[PDB]
Amino acid sequence: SIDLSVDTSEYNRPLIHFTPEKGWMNAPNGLFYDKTAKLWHLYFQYNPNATAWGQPLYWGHATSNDLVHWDEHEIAIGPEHDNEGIFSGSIVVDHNNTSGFFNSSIDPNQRIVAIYTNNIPDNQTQDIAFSLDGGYTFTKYENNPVIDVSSNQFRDPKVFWHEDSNQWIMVVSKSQEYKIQIFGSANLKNWVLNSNFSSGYYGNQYECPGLIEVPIENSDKSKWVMFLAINPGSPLGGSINQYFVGDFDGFQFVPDDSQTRFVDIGKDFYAFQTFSEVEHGVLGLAWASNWQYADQVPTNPWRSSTSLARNYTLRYVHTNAETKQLTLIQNPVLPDSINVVDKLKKKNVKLTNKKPIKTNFKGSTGLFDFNITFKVLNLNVSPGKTHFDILINSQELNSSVDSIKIGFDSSQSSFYIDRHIPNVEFPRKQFFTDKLAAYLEPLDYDQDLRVFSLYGIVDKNIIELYFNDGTVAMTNTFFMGEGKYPHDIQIVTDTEEPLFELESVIIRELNK
Amino acid sequence: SIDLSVDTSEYNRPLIHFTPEKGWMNAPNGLFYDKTAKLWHLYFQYNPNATAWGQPLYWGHATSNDLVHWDEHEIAIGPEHDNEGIFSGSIVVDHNNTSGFFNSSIDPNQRIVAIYTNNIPDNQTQDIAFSLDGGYTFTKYENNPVIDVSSNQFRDPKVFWHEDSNQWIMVVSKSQEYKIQIFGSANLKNWVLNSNFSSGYYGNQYECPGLIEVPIENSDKSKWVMFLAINPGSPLGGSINQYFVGDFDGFQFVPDDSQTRFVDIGKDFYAFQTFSEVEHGVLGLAWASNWQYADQVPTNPWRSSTSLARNYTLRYVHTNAETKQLTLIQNPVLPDSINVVDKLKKKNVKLTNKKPIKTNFKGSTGLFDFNITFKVLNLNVSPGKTHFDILINSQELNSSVDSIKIGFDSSQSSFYIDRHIPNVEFPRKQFFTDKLAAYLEPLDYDQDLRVFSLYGIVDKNIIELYFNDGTVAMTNTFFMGEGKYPHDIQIVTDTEEPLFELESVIIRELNK
């Protein structure tokens, strides 16, 4: 039912965020690294027959050597019937053949098992499938389901090997009971329920849980981080991801505190999953939309991208002037395989109304990043002027320029985005929150002067912001008018004297 | 420093929300009922010298017989020096003279003690003062402070008599340590620290805690509810109030669960306090703004109102189709001293693009309410049309009408507000979030049809929404252009056939 006569790709298909060539994508699934083939695998909730969610629902599949250049493959897993779906799940590598699926002809690093929710009318079960060809084709286990609790709200298994307790661990959502259930298994087939976990912001239901050891920076120690998706009922409206920091013994997750925190405080970062088989640290990505409007955004013949892959650490950071908290840090994976088409580089710039920064690039890919370290100077200005703005401008088309704005206000110690584009209309835009804010403590002090940093990347219809070296992340989609895409970046202020010193400014036009 | 030559009152001063005649108001303080005088007392953080926060900072004072008609009095409490402030606090009635301040000539119901934070350079302490004239003038205790922990982040005491443990209880914020501290006292002068409580959404700092016994509807049971204000770092940006439900023994508050929930999910409901000496149930109100922009909004010669007084209960409500949670309910206090100028009443209205509801009132007070029960019918419509909208329109003034919109989308089971008023500019409007949403389960089912209810009241610059008989509350200010205020209400949809039946619609023009 997709109309291949209208293609928006030229102006709003991301270059380095994965999108399916056609149809509908939601949650990322089965994320893993093949150490033998040296390949990253992305699977995803996929409806090839429309640009909206529907059954039959499949695992789509793509691979990358570098987490930015993706090759889309044939559908990996499909349902038995048209009114069924292969819902979310994860992949593990069964190196030691605990499952019995793998003989000496399958390299240990390629002993690939998918654990997923099978959705049929009035029933959700956890099922497994194995791949003998490096994750391209799967055979479903003959004795599926591996877990059935007679529920239609029981989904999204994330599985990992727990060395300390010598077993497989599954975290899975009992979605409308607001429980993350922790199961254990010797062989991925026979599972025992070990504990239930309930905390944080409940919203309407629990989805896509995760549980992983995240490294503490400058340390050989880690904490266990429980990830949890809720939708609807996010405090920002719709879908959001949250996390909990604590310890895990193979049976029970015990948070260090009872505080609620979000992974990303943009509108468009949901169903976060981590890659299995990562040698150094923790990598993950999410679905870069919001259930409130994901199926209505003006893209064709596809809807949805993933976020960039991000690298997850824990750092002690000031959440106020007195107090440090061990906080989830994330920074984008952007390797040297990305081409720099053109660059603006400045240092020690005193920003004023007479000294704007303006890119003057020959053309546009619609893919840019900006990297700024700035200091707030001791200058008293009128309350309307305590800010500077990064403007992302389209080309002029039909006599107008569309823009989005990213700013910082020194009186509020807060970043903000305004993704309001007048004259772009789509269904459920009343839920498409335009103004988002993030409070941060200074990254550092230079004498008495507050220092902050900002890294942003814009990729045709998505902007990802990382405040203070990944202390806070904010992911938002944006939809410029037909044919319009990012062409030029400006950094402006209305202050006559300098309130902000840009210690370092690097703005790059990028390409695949 | 206030310019009394410019007065916006005629178009944007609320009729039934308390505002100071001039200057700056923030947190409500010292809320209590005088059972002898039959008088409600409102005190508030008050800067009479500007329409922005500054020291010296005072307790302003107003009284009401009905919680809508307020009489403003002389300042009740002031600081010793100009670089000091009487910060937030509470009042108790010391009926049995545990303090020793009151002889036989002071009616027991009028034995009024204020407990407040004294803010001086580099020090915040808890201090007390007593009134011998029914709360109009205070004498500070000669041995203040009553609590000093050598901190400049130690504020907002809410004190109550705990009958079960036969002592005074103080909840107070150790703001940047993220602790609510619970102290106990025989006499309001000598305090012992009994416990610390840390939970929920931390943001930047803890403020204005509260702890009170709230009744469960249709039962003789109750729970203890801990209230907590955070600012900045609200997930909605800036300032917000949250709550915890559990039990209290006079020493330790123990929540029933570790979930985070907000009292009000509008932008403009902060520093909530409950009235002391309420006979039946729990009444409270808040400051109806957000620290991000409170001191920049285009009102003069005052800034800020309170919310309406609200009546607080607990009810088991569906947060999803399967699961009920004991949830905080709030409904506005709107007594018979409010006059109905005009009303539109409709019932069993099958709403369509050809059947809009439009008020045709002769003039406008700028004060209206709307009370709607509606059913979602089984009709498949295009995704752009799965909603209806309540439009609140200004008069046409120099050929333009300003409006705000409250809607419901049946596909998302969510209400929304859009307070976006283009052309009205003020400092820090980048933080003035325009689009807010609230997910709700149906109030009821009529066979298979989903039933919802909405009560809204608009009072010149503030709209308060109560979804499903107070299941969710949302408070937002809005600023129409110079001279413009609400005049007419419309209820519209774009559906050609009926998707919504308005079972009952009552729209009233009100006056004081």
Ligand SMILES: *[C@@H]1O[C@H](CO)[C@@H](O[C@@H]2O[C@H](CO)[C@@H](O[C@@H]3O[C@H](CO)[C@@H](O)[C@H](O)[C@@H]3O)[C@H](O)[C@H]2NC(C)=O)[C@H](O)[C@H]1NC(C)=O
């Ligand atoms: C994600 O960020 C982490 C840093 O937090 C990166 O981990 C680092 O990765 C490199 C490999 O690229 C490691 O270097 C190797 O370490 C071994 C053992 O010391 C050494 O013998 C090898 O010669 C090699 O240099 C490095 O140790 C590691 N750092 C930590 C703290 O684990 C990781 O590369 C990032 N991943 C991506 C995709 O960006």
Ligand SMILES: *[C@@H]1O[C@H](CO)[C@@H](O[C@@H]2O[C@H](CO)[C@@H](O)[C@H](O)[C@H]2NC(C)=O)[C@H](O)[C@H]1NC(C)=O
């Ligand atoms: C707030 O709500 C409670 C009901 O939830 C009201 O309590 C009743 O008040 C009347 C007197 O006005 C008593 O005779 C009843 O016994 C009370 N009922 C319960 C269940 O306690 C209270 O009146 C309300 N207050 C306001 C101002 O609306």
Ligand SMILES: OC[C@H](O)[C@H](O)CO[C@]1(CO)O[C@H](CO)[C@@H](O)[C@@H]1O
């Ligand atoms: O249908 C499930 C419900 O609508 C969720 O809010 C979306 O569900 C998720 C998360 O968005 O997508 C998957 C199905 O495509 C499912 O496995 C997962 O829990």
Ligand SMILES: OC[C@H](O)[C@H](O)CO[C@]1(CO)O[C@H](CO)[C@@H](O)[C@@H]1O
């Ligand atoms: O001290 C100001 C602080 O940063 C808060 O965000 C505002 O403080 C409050 C709450 O808004 O106002 C009062 C003083 O006006 C103080 O008692 C209370 O904690």
Ligand SMILES: *[C@@H]1O[C@H](CO)[C@@H](O)[C@H](O)[C@H]1NC(C)=O
């Ligand atoms: C859906 O897409 C699948 C996979 O391409 C295809 O085989 C099938 O015919 C389609 N089903 C429907 C209902 O269109």
Ligand SMILES: *[C@@H]1O[C@H](CO)[C@@H](O)[C@H](O)[C@H]1NC(C)=O
């Ligand atoms: C090992 O598995 C391979 C791949 O399916 C299969 O072809 C082969 O027969 C198996 N070998 C043995 C010894 O069973």
Ligand SMILES: *[C@@H]1O[C@H](CO)[C@@H](O)[C@H](O)[C@H]1NC(C)=O
């Ligand atoms: C966990 O939750 C399940 C499903 O509700 C319940 O049956 C079981 O009693 C709980 N188990 C534990 C260990 O709490």
Ligand SMILES: *[C@@H]1O[C@H](CO)[C@@H](O)[C@H](O)[C@H]1NC(C)=O
């Ligand atoms: C941003 O600049 C910092 C400081 O120069 C640098 O170390 C970092 O790698 C840059 N970030 C990105 C994403 O390129």
Ligand SMILES: *[C@@H]1O[C@H](CO)[C@@H](O)[C@H](O)[C@H]1NC(C)=O
């Ligand atoms: C502030 O207002 C108070 C009370 O009206 C008044 O006594 C005083 O003159 C004012 N102080 C300053 C510093 O403006």
Ligand SMILES: *[C@@H]1O[C@H](CO)[C@@H](O)[C@H](O)[C@H]1NC(C)=O
């Ligand atoms: C109570 O104290 C007041 C002064 O505050 C005084 O007017 C009065 O005489 C006293 N009454 C008694 C009964 O001691």
Ligand SMILES: *[C@@H]1O[C@H](CO)[C@@H](O)[C@H](O)[C@H]1NC(C)=O
């Ligand atoms: C409560 O918190 C205070 C301030 O951090 C601390 O000194 C005290 O030891 C704590 N008391 C208890 C009983 O936890």
Ligand SMILES: *[C@@H]1O[C@H](CO)[C@@H](O)[C@H](O)[C@H]1NC(C)=O
């Ligand atoms: C709204 O309508 C209901 C009847 O459905 C009524 O009982 C209730 O009091 C009304 N609310 C207000 C605040 O007027």
Ligand SMILES: [Zn+2]
């Ligand atoms: Zn606009």
